[PDB]
């Protein structure tokens, strides 16, 4: 009923980018965690959210060697079924956590700039911790469904550790993948446009600090859309082609799978990009 | 391992801690302003429009303000000035009509220069009020401004002279990279200074929130 | 001044229910913990229930556990004791006692007045072993109270209290922690002793000191009063 | 007048000559053969939390267990140092508090500040709360320090160059002390509560007489304001803390200067001064967030009480000399040992 | 003025007629007092954890 594909060029083009992202993201997240662990004597709600985002990003990065081995040998997985399930439900759960924390940071900035006197701007650290725990529980609940139903698919070379199978029927994974990009994109775009419009209306764009803040706000959204657009584009193309055509042929989806994985590489690239954009770009540093 | 009395004492301490936290949360959302001035320079008029320290409370647009007046303190300022290190803004009142009287304008210059460059107010905005508008106009209609300013060279009109005091007062702020000073003219009957103070404190609060988030 | 007034007495049939109230006026009611102490006719005192400050901690005597309910209403300074399904063994006067707990405080400082409740039809044991003592005025008297488990805690405090009940009057605090003297008490009364063996001493026995003396423990929250030593002549 | 232009100079010259002839040797020369104290390491045994603003003063109870702290958040807290419990929390009418004190008996506390009023609170009441027993007025400047002589007397120092002795029962100034030419910042009482000394902003200190009400001695030698002062446990000497990064030891009987505790690396001013039980150690809080321990008999640093994130404003030592408590502008109190 | 000058002169005259003892005697008394109570200082000589109320 489903359809899987193994290729060769991906094994020669993906490992370099994957290793570069691993090295750079690991270095950046290590530096950020080292800075936050000791130098942070001023833990506030926004600092808590940024630290949680960094933790989720680092946890996403640490699992990269497992797919390093996978793409090192074209399509093989000599680790076991349990390793495959834990590894997969580790990014597909760390991707959503990072997106949620990005949206939370954007909403926090919107409330801090547009409604300065609102009560939400002076919440305690305990409330921030409770909100963080609730968000973590929510994302774990959404992504935990993959642990129940496991499939290593020992048919193609007896090892295909995949979750994004090009099948015919729909499933929660594809819907969640589509939803994790659209609604957060709208929220981020609105919260970033209103901030700049309000700052321009009051004519506070005189000092260099305000201009720098505006460029940082724009850069955040640009990075987000650049990292997360092509995956959704390719997925929508896949759905349209699958519904219009027939899945029994299984020869048209050939290069689309390789394109989808090369684009998921761009999706991973956000993990490397993030540390400099948020923590290192602050004027305080 | 605690006894009954120790447990009850711990419960009482926890209740005291809860009350203290609630009081701090209540008092952390109020706007604090320090009202300075050179004396007899419209401070009474400003107070009308809204022993030791004197506190005044007024509410505008669901916001609670506190104004502290330290005019009666005749001791050394270098000892108790650091107490007001967390104020959101500083309100400065200078009378324009005192430009040709004894010289008082130079004393105002000295006070503003001392206040604006203190080691504590390195990031605190200053709101400047210029009073006696109509009286200053009436005075300059006959008395030239060159008596107060030996180096002045310009038309003897209200528009030119008012701007000249403006720049001379703003030049003393030699920390332009962190502090912004907001200036406004006023008279006996304006009924608009509350809005100006509200705008200034909203700007200060927005900047403080941006600094707290680390964005700018 | 400080005073407590209670009401809610009368005749009750077996298995019925009744509500008691304690009206307080003259002190900070919200900062005090309240006790309920009853006394059967000629059968000494007996702890019943306790409610803390802020209603965060409640304890009950096992004899009425699950049968009585205690509540407080700080708005109007009233203390309630809701009881249902009472038996003949609960006929007794009921006292309203205040107590504030902090370092150096004096619990059980002031007592209520008492309302009659005539009705138709582990566990530290404190022993006094004395019934009556005939004493002439001007002499010196000694009263001994002994417990089961040592009352000396690790902090060094020894939680033992002394009370005196004049004829037809509420009990008054005399000594707390076996060495301190309650406010308003003459210096003649003195407390001493060691763990498990205590003793109260009166230097100059004068008039108005005749009555019954009880010793209370405050280590394990199930509180037990002594049998009571009576002073005659 | 013309006479004072020479009489004051002649008197000062005579005093200087008497002091010079009275200085046969130095403290270091005599205490050069004494063995050094050695390194002193102290650890933060307890940390007290609850204040939400800068801490400006604190005092120790006579029982060496209870203490009271004052801060500009409008609260006066009494702590149980052994268990870090809050016995009381008094709300102040004016939040510009600059000092606090504990009665020797333990029944009353006092506080003051920019309101020019010293308020006295009663802790043991039948109502079960804390209420203001008396409010004292009469000072024309901010109140800097206050100490309890007994349950019915109190001595205060204000910013109007005067110190006064009060009578709590009535509230009238019993005696007034004058002579300073600058703001008086702190005072300390003798062990026998018969004399006391004050440190004013005119870079000088004086020794008064409570029974009489006249300055019996004047000590000079500093170069800036004086922010702290404390009596030696013997009662025949005292130490001062100035803004020129230098503490000094003065003796009443000799009417001289004895020592000076300064180091090149220190440039910040001293905010508090206190002694040990035997008077062999001298602690002092600085503006560099530290608190150095000086060997009072040899003028050599013995240790530092680092661990504060802002200026240290208050410092006290228990009556039994068992612990040292410091308070800083970070709204934290630490007990060392 | 005249009153202030007279008061200052009187204060100087009063303070200039006091007795002073040698600095060596004061130093000897200071060191004797310091050494007399050397053993009664918990801070100077650390106390065992058994007798430390703040121990933890
Ligand atoms: O969620 C993701 O981003 C990928 O599915 C992770 C992955 C990639 C290759 C092999 C296994 C897992």
Coordinates of C-alpha atoms in Angstrom, one line a residue, chain B residues 55-200:
Chain B
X55 CA 4.5 62.0 48.5
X56 CA 1.6 62.6 46.1
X57 CA -0.5 59.9 44.5
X58 CA -2.7 60.4 41.4
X59 CA -4.2 58.0 38.8
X60 CA -4.3 58.5 35.1
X61 CA -5.6 56.0 32.5
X62 CA -5.7 53.2 35.1
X63 CA -2.0 53.9 36.1
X64 CA -0.9 54.8 39.6
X65 CA 1.8 57.4 39.9
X66 CA 3.9 58.5 42.8
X67 CA 5.7 61.9 43.0
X68 CA 8.4 62.5 45.6
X69 CA 9.3 66.1 46.5
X70 CA 12.6 66.6 48.4
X71 CA 12.6 70.4 48.4
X72 CA 12.6 70.6 52.2
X73 CA 15.9 68.7 52.6
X74 CA 18.6 71.1 53.4
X75 CA 21.3 68.5 54.1
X76 CA 24.0 67.2 51.7
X77 CA 22.6 65.7 48.5
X78 CA 25.6 63.4 48.0
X79 CA 24.4 61.1 50.9
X80 CA 20.7 60.4 50.1
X81 CA 20.6 60.8 46.4
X82 CA 21.4 57.1 45.8
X83 CA 18.1 56.1 47.4
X84 CA 16.2 57.1 44.3
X85 CA 18.2 54.9 42.0
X86 CA 15.2 52.9 40.7
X87 CA 12.9 55.8 39.8
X88 CA 11.4 55.6 36.3
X89 CA 11.9 59.3 35.4
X90 CA 13.0 62.7 36.9
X91 CA 10.8 65.8 36.6
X92 CA 12.7 69.1 36.4
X93 CA 11.0 72.4 36.8
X94 CA 12.7 75.7 35.7
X95 CA 11.0 79.1 35.7
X96 CA 11.6 81.1 32.5
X97 CA 10.7 84.5 34.0
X98 CA 13.7 84.2 36.4
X99 CA 16.2 84.6 33.5
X100 CA 16.8 88.3 34.3
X101 CA 16.6 88.1 38.1
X102 CA 19.1 87.5 40.9
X103 CA 21.3 84.8 37.9
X104 CA 18.8 82.1 39.0
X105 CA 19.0 80.6 35.5
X106 CA 22.7 79.9 36.1
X107 CA 21.8 78.2 39.4
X108 CA 19.3 76.1 37.4
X109 CA 22.1 75.2 35.0
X110 CA 24.4 74.1 37.8
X111 CA 21.6 72.0 39.4
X112 CA 20.7 70.4 36.1
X113 CA 24.4 69.7 35.2
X114 CA 24.9 68.1 38.6
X115 CA 21.8 65.9 38.4
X116 CA 22.0 64.8 34.8
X117 CA 25.6 63.4 35.1
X118 CA 25.4 61.6 38.5
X119 CA 26.9 58.2 38.8
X120 CA 23.4 56.8 39.7
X121 CA 21.3 58.5 37.0
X122 CA 23.3 57.1 34.0
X123 CA 20.2 55.6 32.3
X124 CA 17.3 57.5 33.9
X125 CA 15.3 59.8 31.5
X126 CA 14.6 63.4 32.6
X127 CA 11.4 65.3 31.9
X128 CA 11.9 69.1 31.7
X129 CA 9.1 71.6 32.4
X130 CA 9.5 75.3 31.5
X131 CA 7.0 77.5 33.3
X132 CA 5.9 81.1 33.4
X133 CA 5.3 81.1 29.6
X134 CA 3.1 84.2 29.4
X135 CA 5.2 86.0 32.1
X136 CA 8.4 85.2 30.2
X137 CA 6.8 86.6 27.0
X138 CA 5.8 89.8 28.8
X139 CA 9.2 90.2 30.3
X140 CA 11.1 89.6 27.0
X141 CA 8.7 92.1 25.3
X142 CA 10.8 94.8 27.1
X143 CA 13.9 93.2 28.7
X144 CA 16.4 91.7 26.3
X145 CA 17.7 88.2 26.9
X146 CA 21.3 89.3 26.5
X147 CA 21.4 90.3 30.2
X148 CA 21.3 86.6 31.2
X149 CA 23.3 85.4 28.1
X150 CA 26.3 87.7 27.3
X151 CA 27.0 85.7 24.1
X152 CA 23.5 85.6 22.7
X153 CA 23.0 87.0 19.2
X154 CA 19.5 86.8 17.8
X155 CA 16.1 88.4 17.4
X156 CA 14.4 89.6 20.6
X157 CA 11.3 87.5 20.2
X158 CA 9.7 84.7 22.2
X159 CA 10.1 82.1 19.5
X160 CA 13.9 82.5 19.1
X161 CA 14.6 83.0 22.8
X162 CA 12.6 80.0 24.0
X163 CA 14.5 77.7 21.6
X164 CA 17.8 79.1 22.8
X165 CA 17.2 78.2 26.4
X166 CA 16.2 74.8 25.0
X167 CA 19.5 74.0 23.4
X168 CA 21.6 75.4 26.2
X169 CA 19.8 73.2 28.7
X170 CA 20.0 70.1 26.5
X171 CA 23.7 70.6 25.8
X172 CA 24.6 69.7 29.4
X173 CA 23.4 66.1 28.9
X174 CA 26.7 64.7 27.8
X175 CA 25.4 61.1 27.9
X176 CA 23.3 61.2 24.8
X177 CA 23.9 57.5 23.9
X178 CA 21.8 56.2 26.8
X179 CA 19.6 58.9 28.2
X180 CA 16.9 60.9 26.4
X181 CA 15.4 64.0 27.9
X182 CA 11.8 65.1 27.2
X183 CA 11.0 68.8 27.2
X184 CA 7.6 70.6 27.3
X185 CA 6.4 74.2 27.7
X186 CA 3.7 75.0 30.2
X187 CA 1.9 77.9 31.8
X188 CA -0.6 78.4 34.7
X189 CA -3.5 76.8 32.8
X190 CA -2.6 74.0 30.4
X191 CA -4.4 70.8 31.5
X192 CA -2.2 68.7 29.3
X193 CA 0.9 68.0 31.3
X194 CA -0.6 64.7 32.5
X195 CA -0.6 63.4 28.9
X196 CA 3.0 64.5 28.4
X197 CA 4.1 62.7 31.5
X198 CA 2.1 59.6 30.5
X199 CA 3.8 59.6 27.0
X200 CA 7.3 59.9 28.6

